[PDB]
Amino acid sequence: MSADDFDAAVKYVSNTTTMMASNDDKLCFYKYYKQATVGDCNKPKPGMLQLQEKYKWEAWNALRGMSTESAKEAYVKLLDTLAPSWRN
Hints:
The protein is an all-alpha fold. It is built from four helices and no strands.
């Protein structure tokens, strides 16, 4: 399973961020750490002058209801796009 290996994943993304990553990809590992911890989005709407906020508020709310293993399972498959050198 890739739900327990999430540890080595969060440490690779939290410590290493110089890897070739996109602007939308960096928002994936962010919504996973929240869904794999809480479960769903339940925060008030962000500012009204920022764009990224919407992407960070819509994403976390998009996977609203996701399970713990469900998110962690995505952190391993998604992280592969940022730094696949962690699995191999």
